[PDB]
Design a protein around this ligand. Sequence first.
Ligand code: ZN
Lengths: 33, 131, 319
Amino acid sequence: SNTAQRLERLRKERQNQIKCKNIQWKERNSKQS
Amino acid sequence: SFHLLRQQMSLTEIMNTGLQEHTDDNCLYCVCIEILGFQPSNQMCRILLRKEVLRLVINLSSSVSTKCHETGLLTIKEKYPQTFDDICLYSEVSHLLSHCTFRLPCRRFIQELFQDVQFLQMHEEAEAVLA
Amino acid sequence: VGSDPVILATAGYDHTVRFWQAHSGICTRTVQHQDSQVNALEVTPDRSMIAAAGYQHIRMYDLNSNNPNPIISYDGVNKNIASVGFHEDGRWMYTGGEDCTARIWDLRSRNLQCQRIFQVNAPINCVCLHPNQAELIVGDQSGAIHIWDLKTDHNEQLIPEPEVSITSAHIDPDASYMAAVNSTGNCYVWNLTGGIGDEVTQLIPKTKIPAHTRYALQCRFSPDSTLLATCSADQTCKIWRTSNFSLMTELSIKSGNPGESSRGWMWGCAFSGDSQYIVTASSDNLARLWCVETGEIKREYGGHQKAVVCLAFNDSVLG
Ligand SMILES: [Zn+2]
Protein backbone atom coordinates (compact mmCIF):
# COMPACT_ATOMS: atom_id res chain seq x y z
CA SER A 1 0.00 0.00 0.00
CA ASN A 2 1.06 3.61 0.55
CA THR A 3 2.68 3.39 3.99
CA ALA A 4 3.84 -0.18 3.29
CA GLN A 5 6.15 1.12 0.55
CA ARG A 6 7.44 3.88 2.83
CA LEU A 7 8.14 1.40 5.64
CA GLU A 8 10.45 -0.68 3.44
CA ARG A 9 11.81 2.46 1.77
CA LEU A 10 12.95 3.81 5.15
CA ARG A 11 14.75 0.55 5.92
CA LYS A 12 16.86 0.90 2.76
CA GLU A 13 18.70 3.99 4.02
CA ARG A 14 18.94 2.52 7.53
CA GLN A 15 21.49 -0.03 6.31
CA ASN A 16 23.75 2.73 4.96
CA GLN A 17 23.13 5.00 7.97
CA ILE A 18 24.94 2.68 10.42
CA LYS A 19 28.34 2.95 8.68
CA CYS A 20 29.31 6.16 10.52
CA LYS A 21 30.53 6.51 14.11
CA ASN A 22 29.31 9.63 15.92
CA ILE A 23 30.95 10.80 19.16
CA GLN A 24 29.18 13.63 20.96
CA TRP A 25 30.82 16.15 23.31
CA LYS A 26 29.48 15.47 26.80
CA GLU A 27 29.97 18.24 29.37
CA ARG A 28 32.02 16.03 31.68
CA ASN A 29 35.67 16.15 32.72
CA SER A 30 38.04 15.32 35.58
CA LYS A 31 37.09 18.46 37.47
CA GLN A 32 37.63 16.84 40.88
CA SER A 33 40.82 15.02 39.77
CA SER B 1 2.32 11.89 32.79
CA PHE B 2 4.50 10.41 30.05
CA HIS B 3 3.51 13.25 27.70
CA LEU B 4 5.08 15.87 29.97
CA LEU B 5 8.24 13.92 30.80
CA ARG B 6 8.90 12.99 27.16
CA GLN B 7 9.79 16.52 26.02
CA GLN B 8 12.75 16.76 28.44
CA MET B 9 14.23 13.34 27.56
CA SER B 10 14.78 10.86 24.71
CA LEU B 11 13.42 7.43 23.84
CA THR B 12 16.83 5.77 24.24
CA GLU B 13 17.78 7.75 27.37
CA ILE B 14 14.87 6.47 29.47
CA MET B 15 15.55 2.84 28.53
CA ASN B 16 19.14 3.24 29.77
CA THR B 17 -0.81 -0.70 32.43
CA GLY B 18 0.50 1.63 29.75
CA LEU B 19 -2.98 2.02 28.24
CA GLN B 20 -4.65 5.00 29.89
CA GLU B 21 -8.31 4.71 28.81
CA HIS B 22 -8.38 0.91 29.09
CA THR B 23 -11.34 -0.36 31.11
CA ASP B 24 -13.04 -3.75 30.91
CA ASP B 25 -15.96 -2.59 28.77
CA ASN B 26 -14.43 -1.11 25.59
CA CYS B 27 -11.77 -3.65 24.59
CA LEU B 28 -12.07 -6.25 21.84
CA TYR B 29 -10.51 -9.05 23.92
CA CYS B 30 -11.07 -7.98 27.53
CA VAL B 31 -14.85 -7.68 27.11
CA CYS B 32 -15.18 -11.43 26.45
CA ILE B 33 -13.63 -12.54 29.76
CA GLU B 34 -16.99 -12.60 31.55
CA ILE B 35 -19.65 -12.87 28.83
CA LEU B 36 -17.80 -15.47 26.76
CA GLY B 37 -15.23 -16.90 29.18
CA PHE B 38 -11.87 -16.06 27.64
CA GLN B 39 -8.55 -16.36 29.46
CA PRO B 40 -6.56 -13.36 30.76
CA SER B 41 -4.03 -11.94 28.33
CA ASN B 42 -0.29 -12.46 28.80
CA GLN B 43 2.69 -10.15 28.37
CA MET B 44 9.09 -3.04 31.62
CA CYS B 45 10.75 -2.79 28.22
CA ARG B 46 7.43 -3.11 26.36
CA ILE B 47 5.41 -0.83 28.67
CA LEU B 48 7.38 2.28 27.67
CA LEU B 49 6.71 1.61 23.98
CA ARG B 50 2.92 1.76 24.39
CA LYS B 51 3.09 5.30 25.79
CA GLU B 52 5.42 6.48 23.02
CA VAL B 53 3.06 5.05 20.39
CA LEU B 54 0.01 6.54 22.12
CA ARG B 55 1.49 10.02 22.59
CA LEU B 56 2.30 10.27 18.88
CA VAL B 57 -1.34 9.47 18.09
CA ILE B 58 -2.60 12.40 20.17
CA ASN B 59 0.00 14.74 18.67
CA LEU B 60 -1.14 13.57 15.22
CA SER B 61 -4.68 14.85 15.92
CA SER B 62 -3.61 18.50 15.58
CA SER B 63 -1.99 18.16 12.12
CA VAL B 64 0.48 20.90 13.08
CA SER B 65 3.51 18.73 12.21
CA THR B 66 2.26 15.62 10.43
CA LYS B 67 5.58 14.63 8.85
CA CYS B 68 7.46 14.66 12.16
CA HIS B 69 4.89 12.48 13.92
CA GLU B 70 4.48 10.08 10.99
CA THR B 71 8.25 9.62 10.81
CA GLY B 72 8.38 8.74 14.51
CA LEU B 73 5.82 5.94 14.19
CA LEU B 74 7.49 4.35 11.16
CA THR B 75 10.80 3.97 13.01
CA ILE B 76 9.11 2.17 15.91
CA LYS B 77 7.50 -0.33 13.52
CA GLU B 78 10.93 -1.05 12.02
CA LYS B 79 13.08 -1.25 15.16
CA TYR B 80 10.32 -3.00 17.16
CA PRO B 81 8.00 -4.66 14.63
CA GLN B 82 6.32 -6.80 17.32
CA THR B 83 4.85 -3.92 19.35
CA PHE B 84 1.91 -3.62 16.92
CA ASP B 85 0.72 -7.15 17.70
CA ASP B 86 -1.32 -6.73 20.91
CA ILE B 87 -5.10 -6.55 20.69
CA CYS B 88 -5.37 -4.28 23.74
CA LEU B 89 -3.22 -1.58 22.12
CA TYR B 90 -5.35 -1.72 18.96
CA SER B 91 -8.48 -1.35 21.10
CA GLU B 92 -7.00 1.72 22.80
CA VAL B 93 -6.09 3.30 19.45
CA SER B 94 -9.51 2.49 17.98
CA HIS B 95 -11.21 4.03 21.01
CA LEU B 96 -9.17 7.22 20.62
CA LEU B 97 -10.06 7.51 16.92
CA SER B 98 -13.74 7.86 17.88
CA HIS B 99 -13.56 10.71 20.41
CA CYS B 100 -10.87 12.70 18.61
CA THR B 101 -10.95 13.95 15.01
CA PHE B 102 -8.31 13.10 12.41
CA ARG B 103 -7.72 14.08 8.81
CA LEU B 104 -8.53 11.37 6.28
CA PRO B 105 -4.91 10.91 5.07
CA CYS B 106 -3.81 10.78 8.72
CA ARG B 107 -6.70 8.51 9.75
CA ARG B 108 -5.87 6.09 6.93
CA PHE B 109 -2.24 6.11 8.10
CA ILE B 110 -3.46 4.68 11.41
CA GLN B 111 -5.40 1.39 11.26
CA GLU B 112 -3.03 0.54 8.40
CA LEU B 113 0.07 -0.36 10.43
CA PHE B 114 -2.13 -3.12 11.91
CA GLN B 115 -3.00 -4.81 8.61
CA ASP B 116 -0.29 -7.49 8.93
CA VAL B 117 -1.23 -8.85 12.35
CA GLN B 118 -2.40 -12.27 13.51
CA PHE B 119 -4.02 -11.66 16.93
CA LEU B 120 -3.49 -15.23 18.10
CA GLN B 121 -4.98 -14.55 21.54
CA MET B 122 -8.48 -13.98 20.16
CA HIS B 123 -8.21 -16.97 17.80
CA GLU B 124 -7.08 -19.33 20.56
CA GLU B 125 -9.84 -18.29 22.97
CA ALA B 126 -12.66 -18.14 20.40
CA GLU B 127 -11.90 -21.66 19.17
CA ALA B 128 -11.95 -23.10 22.69
CA VAL B 129 -15.25 -21.56 23.82
CA LEU B 130 -16.99 -22.35 20.52
CA ALA B 131 -15.91 -26.01 20.50
CA VAL C 1 45.41 3.65 -0.35
CA GLY C 2 47.74 5.22 2.21
CA SER C 3 50.28 2.39 2.09
CA ASP C 4 53.03 4.66 0.76
CA PRO C 5 56.06 6.29 2.41
CA VAL C 6 54.84 9.77 1.40
CA ILE C 7 51.25 10.95 0.95
CA LEU C 8 49.75 14.26 -0.13
CA ALA C 9 46.20 15.51 0.33
CA THR C 10 44.48 18.73 -0.74
CA ALA C 11 41.00 20.08 -0.06
CA GLY C 12 38.99 23.24 -0.53
CA TYR C 13 35.67 24.57 -1.83
CA ASP C 14 35.28 21.71 -4.33
CA HIS C 15 33.56 19.56 -1.64
CA THR C 16 36.02 16.77 -2.50
CA VAL C 17 39.48 16.03 -1.08
CA ARG C 18 42.07 14.72 -3.54
CA PHE C 19 44.89 12.38 -2.50
CA TRP C 20 48.14 12.91 -4.41
CA GLN C 21 51.63 11.43 -4.58
CA ALA C 22 54.97 13.16 -5.01
CA HIS C 23 56.19 10.63 -7.59
CA SER C 24 53.55 11.44 -10.23
CA GLY C 25 50.67 13.83 -10.81
CA ILE C 26 47.96 11.17 -10.98
CA CYS C 27 45.21 11.26 -8.35
CA THR C 28 45.14 8.08 -6.26
CA ARG C 29 41.71 8.54 -4.67
CA THR C 30 38.85 11.04 -4.50
CA VAL C 31 36.91 11.34 -1.25
CA GLN C 32 33.57 13.12 -0.83
CA HIS C 33 32.89 15.92 1.68
CA GLN C 34 29.38 17.37 1.50
CA ASP C 35 27.81 20.62 2.76
CA SER C 36 31.05 21.93 4.28
CA GLN C 37 34.46 23.37 3.45
CA VAL C 38 37.73 22.04 4.86
CA ASN C 39 39.63 24.52 7.03
CA ALA C 40 42.73 22.45 7.83
CA LEU C 41 43.50 18.74 7.66
CA GLU C 42 46.18 16.66 9.38
CA VAL C 43 47.07 12.97 9.53
CA THR C 44 47.33 10.88 12.69
CA PRO C 45 50.85 9.85 13.81
CA ASP C 46 49.94 6.22 13.08
CA ARG C 47 49.68 7.23 9.38
CA SER C 48 46.47 5.23 9.01
CA MET C 49 43.71 7.84 9.46
CA ILE C 50 43.23 11.46 8.39
CA ALA C 51 41.16 14.21 10.00
CA ALA C 52 39.17 16.90 8.19
CA ALA C 53 37.44 19.62 10.22
CA GLY C 54 34.99 22.25 9.04
CA TYR C 55 31.81 23.99 10.24
CA GLN C 56 30.87 22.24 13.50
CA HIS C 57 31.95 18.69 12.54
CA ILE C 58 35.27 16.87 12.23
CA ARG C 59 34.86 14.12 9.65
CA MET C 60 37.43 11.32 9.87
CA TYR C 61 38.46 9.30 6.82
CA ASP C 62 40.25 5.98 6.34
CA LEU C 63 43.52 5.50 4.45
CA ASN C 64 44.22 1.75 4.37
CA SER C 65 40.86 0.92 2.75
CA ASN C 66 38.87 2.79 0.08
CA ASN C 67 35.93 4.36 1.93
CA PRO C 68 34.66 7.72 0.59
CA ASN C 69 32.47 8.17 3.66
CA PRO C 70 33.19 9.78 7.05
CA ILE C 71 33.45 6.60 9.12
CA ILE C 72 34.10 8.63 12.29
CA SER C 73 32.47 12.02 12.88
CA TYR C 74 32.48 14.42 15.83
CA ASP C 75 29.80 16.92 16.84
CA GLY C 76 28.89 19.21 19.72
CA VAL C 77 30.54 22.48 18.75
CA ASN C 78 28.40 25.30 17.35
CA LYS C 79 30.97 27.13 15.19
CA ASN C 80 33.81 26.40 12.77
CA ILE C 81 37.00 24.57 13.75
CA ALA C 82 40.17 26.58 13.15
CA SER C 83 42.65 23.70 13.30
CA VAL C 84 43.19 20.19 14.65
CA GLY C 85 46.16 18.26 15.96
CA PHE C 86 47.22 15.06 17.66
CA HIS C 87 49.58 13.97 20.41
CA GLU C 88 52.87 12.40 19.36
CA ASP C 89 51.68 9.07 20.79
CA GLY C 90 48.15 9.57 19.42
CA ARG C 91 46.50 9.74 22.85
CA TRP C 92 44.38 12.91 22.63
CA MET C 93 43.28 15.34 19.93
CA TYR C 94 43.30 19.11 20.47
CA THR C 95 40.96 21.27 18.38
CA GLY C 96 40.62 25.04 18.11
CA GLY C 97 37.16 26.41 17.37
CA GLU C 98 35.81 29.78 16.27
CA ASP C 99 33.43 29.66 19.27
CA CYS C 100 36.23 30.97 21.55
CA THR C 101 36.79 27.49 23.06
CA ALA C 102 40.05 25.53 22.83
CA ARG C 103 39.33 21.95 23.90
CA ILE C 104 41.02 18.55 23.78
CA TRP C 105 39.32 15.39 22.52
CA ASP C 106 40.01 11.85 23.72
CA LEU C 107 40.65 9.04 21.22
CA ARG C 108 39.82 6.23 23.68
CA SER C 109 36.32 4.74 23.57
CA ARG C 110 36.06 4.62 27.36
CA ASN C 111 35.20 6.87 30.29
CA LEU C 112 38.72 8.27 30.66
CA GLN C 113 37.49 11.90 30.68
CA CYS C 114 40.83 13.29 29.52
CA GLN C 115 39.14 16.34 27.98
CA ARG C 116 39.86 19.90 29.10
CA ILE C 117 38.14 23.14 28.07
CA PHE C 118 39.84 26.54 27.84
CA GLN C 119 37.79 29.73 27.44
CA VAL C 120 38.92 33.00 25.84
CA ASN C 121 37.15 36.28 25.16
CA ALA C 122 37.80 36.30 21.39
CA PRO C 123 37.52 33.72 18.60
CA ILE C 124 40.78 31.90 17.93
CA ASN C 125 42.50 31.17 14.62
CA CYS C 126 45.57 29.01 15.31
CA VAL C 127 46.46 26.35 17.88
CA CYS C 128 50.02 25.08 18.32
CA LEU C 129 51.54 22.28 20.39
CA HIS C 130 54.90 22.44 22.14
CA PRO C 131 57.44 19.85 20.93
CA ASN C 132 57.56 18.33 24.43
CA GLN C 133 53.76 17.78 24.36
CA ALA C 134 53.41 19.63 27.68
CA GLU C 135 52.51 23.17 26.55
CA LEU C 136 50.04 24.61 24.06
CA ILE C 137 49.58 27.96 22.32
CA VAL C 138 46.23 29.66 21.69
CA GLY C 139 45.94 32.72 19.48
CA ASP C 140 42.76 34.78 19.14
CA GLN C 141 41.61 37.63 16.91
CA SER C 142 42.59 40.24 19.53
CA GLY C 143 46.32 39.67 18.98
CA ALA C 144 46.80 38.10 22.42
CA ILE C 145 48.81 34.86 22.50
CA HIS C 146 47.86 32.57 25.39
CA ILE C 147 50.53 30.05 26.39
CA TRP C 148 48.54 27.17 27.88
CA ASP C 149 50.39 24.66 30.06
CA LEU C 150 48.94 21.17 30.45
CA LYS C 151 50.58 20.47 33.83
CA THR C 152 48.87 23.46 35.46
CA ASP C 153 45.54 25.20 34.80
CA HIS C 154 46.83 28.77 34.34
CA ASN C 155 47.90 30.28 31.02
CA GLU C 156 50.11 33.32 30.50
CA GLN C 157 48.65 36.03 28.25
CA LEU C 158 51.08 37.78 25.89
CA ILE C 159 50.05 40.42 23.36
CA PRO C 160 52.65 42.10 21.10
CA GLU C 161 50.23 44.68 19.68
CA PRO C 162 46.43 45.04 19.86
CA GLU C 163 43.83 45.80 17.18
CA VAL C 164 45.47 43.22 14.88
CA SER C 165 44.37 39.59 14.58
CA ILE C 166 47.00 36.85 14.40
CA THR C 167 46.56 33.98 11.95
CA SER C 168 49.20 31.31 12.57
CA ALA C 169 51.78 30.20 15.12
CA HIS C 170 54.28 27.35 15.05
CA ILE C 171 57.22 25.93 17.00
CA ASP C 172 60.17 24.23 15.36
CA PRO C 173 60.65 20.54 16.28
CA ASP C 174 64.16 21.28 17.56
CA ALA C 175 62.69 23.85 20.01
CA SER C 176 64.89 26.81 19.08
CA TYR C 177 62.50 29.65 18.17
CA MET C 178 58.78 30.46 18.28
CA ALA C 179 57.24 32.54 15.49
CA ALA C 180 53.80 33.97 14.78
CA VAL C 181 52.25 36.34 12.24
CA ASN C 182 49.33 38.76 12.33
CA SER C 183 46.91 40.48 9.93
CA THR C 184 49.48 43.10 8.86
CA GLY C 185 52.32 40.78 7.81
CA ASN C 186 54.68 41.35 10.74
CA CYS C 187 56.28 38.05 11.79
CA TYR C 188 57.11 38.17 15.50
CA VAL C 189 59.64 35.65 16.80
CA TRP C 190 60.21 34.91 20.49
CA ASN C 191 62.80 32.65 22.09
CA LEU C 192 60.91 29.74 23.63
CA THR C 193 61.27 28.15 27.07
CA GLY C 194 64.81 27.29 28.10
CA GLY C 195 63.61 25.60 31.28
CA ILE C 196 63.26 22.03 30.01
CA GLY C 197 63.10 20.78 33.60
CA ASP C 198 60.09 22.41 35.27
CA GLU C 199 58.69 24.29 32.23
CA VAL C 200 59.31 27.82 33.48
CA THR C 201 57.66 29.03 30.22
CA GLN C 202 59.69 32.22 29.89
CA LEU C 203 59.70 34.22 26.65
CA ILE C 204 61.73 37.14 25.28
CA PRO C 205 61.27 39.17 22.06
CA LYS C 206 64.03 38.05 19.71
CA THR C 207 63.48 39.86 16.40
CA LYS C 208 60.91 41.37 14.05
CA ILE C 209 61.11 40.93 10.27
CA PRO C 210 59.17 43.55 8.25
CA ALA C 211 57.68 41.78 5.23
CA HIS C 212 54.40 40.67 3.65
CA THR C 213 52.77 44.08 3.28
CA ARG C 214 49.41 42.40 2.64
CA TYR C 215 47.69 39.90 4.94
CA ALA C 216 49.80 37.12 6.45
CA LEU C 217 48.07 33.74 6.32
CA GLN C 218 50.34 30.96 7.60
CA CYS C 219 53.86 30.60 9.00
CA ARG C 220 55.51 27.25 9.65
CA PHE C 221 58.96 25.92 10.51
CA SER C 222 60.88 22.97 9.04
CA PRO C 223 61.86 19.63 10.62
CA ASP C 224 65.55 20.59 10.63
CA SER C 225 64.64 23.97 12.21
CA THR C 226 66.86 25.81 9.71
CA LEU C 227 64.10 27.33 7.54
CA LEU C 228 60.97 29.40 8.12
CA ALA C 229 58.30 29.84 5.43
CA THR C 230 55.54 32.43 5.84
CA CYS C 231 52.52 32.63 3.56
CA SER C 232 50.95 35.92 2.52
CA ALA C 233 47.97 37.33 0.64
CA ASP C 234 50.11 39.07 -2.00
CA GLN C 235 50.61 35.73 -3.83
CA THR C 236 54.18 35.52 -2.51
CA CYS C 237 55.95 33.20 -0.07
CA LYS C 238 59.27 34.06 1.58
CA ILE C 239 61.61 31.49 3.16
CA TRP C 240 63.65 32.76 6.11
CA ARG C 241 66.83 31.34 7.62
CA THR C 242 67.48 30.82 11.32
CA SER C 243 71.01 32.28 11.28
CA ASN C 244 70.29 36.00 10.81
CA PHE C 245 66.66 35.93 9.56
CA SER C 246 67.63 37.02 6.05
CA LEU C 247 65.72 36.33 2.83
CA MET C 248 66.89 32.86 1.82
CA THR C 249 64.58 32.29 -1.16
CA GLU C 250 61.64 34.30 -2.49
CA LEU C 251 58.68 32.55 -4.12
CA SER C 252 55.96 34.20 -6.20
CA ILE C 253 53.07 33.14 -8.43
CA LYS C 254 52.14 36.52 -9.91
CA SER C 255 51.71 36.48 -13.68
CA GLY C 256 52.93 40.07 -14.07
CA ASN C 257 49.79 41.18 -15.93
CA PRO C 258 47.54 43.91 -14.48
CA GLY C 259 44.45 42.19 -15.91
CA GLU C 260 44.41 39.45 -13.26
CA SER C 261 44.45 41.59 -10.08
CA SER C 262 45.26 39.04 -7.36
CA ARG C 263 43.67 36.08 -9.11
CA GLY C 264 44.22 33.91 -6.02
CA TRP C 265 45.86 34.02 -2.61
CA MET C 266 48.55 31.66 -1.31
CA TRP C 267 47.20 29.82 1.72
CA GLY C 268 49.36 26.97 3.02
CA CYS C 269 52.84 25.51 2.77
CA ALA C 270 54.55 22.35 3.99
CA PHE C 271 58.09 20.96 4.11
CA SER C 272 59.48 17.52 3.33
CA GLY C 273 61.62 15.25 5.49
CA ASP C 274 64.89 16.68 4.17
CA SER C 275 63.58 20.28 4.03
CA GLN C 276 64.50 20.43 0.33
CA TYR C 277 61.18 20.46 -1.56
CA ILE C 278 58.12 22.32 -0.29
CA VAL C 279 54.46 21.86 -1.23
CA THR C 280 52.24 24.93 -1.57
CA ALA C 281 48.45 25.12 -2.01
CA SER C 282 47.10 28.36 -3.48
CA SER C 283 43.53 29.51 -4.08
CA ASP C 284 43.94 29.26 -7.87
CA ASN C 285 42.33 25.79 -7.98
CA LEU C 286 45.74 24.09 -8.14
CA ALA C 287 48.79 23.18 -6.08
CA ARG C 288 52.48 23.45 -6.93
CA LEU C 289 55.70 21.74 -5.86
CA TRP C 290 58.63 24.09 -5.28
CA CYS C 291 62.35 23.81 -4.56
CA VAL C 292 64.16 25.94 -1.98
CA GLU C 293 67.28 26.42 -4.14
CA THR C 294 66.44 26.67 -7.85
CA GLY C 295 63.23 28.62 -7.17
CA GLU C 296 61.52 27.17 -10.23
CA ILE C 297 58.67 24.75 -9.56
CA LYS C 298 59.03 20.98 -9.82
CA ARG C 299 55.52 19.56 -10.36
CA GLU C 300 52.01 20.97 -10.65
CA TYR C 301 48.70 19.42 -9.58
CA GLY C 302 45.49 20.70 -11.14
CA GLY C 303 42.83 18.12 -10.35
CA HIS C 304 40.65 20.46 -8.28
CA GLN C 305 37.77 22.53 -9.64
CA LYS C 306 37.56 25.12 -6.84
CA ALA C 307 40.13 26.86 -4.66
CA VAL C 308 42.07 24.82 -2.10
CA VAL C 309 42.88 26.37 1.28
CA CYS C 310 44.47 23.42 3.09
CA LEU C 311 46.99 20.65 2.47
CA ALA C 312 48.65 17.84 4.42
CA PHE C 313 52.11 16.51 3.54
CA ASN C 314 54.08 14.03 5.64
CA ASP C 315 56.71 11.41 4.82
CA SER C 316 59.08 9.02 6.57
CA VAL C 317 60.91 10.32 9.64
CA LEU C 318 64.30 9.42 8.15
CA GLY C 319 65.60 11.74 5.45
ZN1 ZN D 1 -7.70 -5.15 26.73
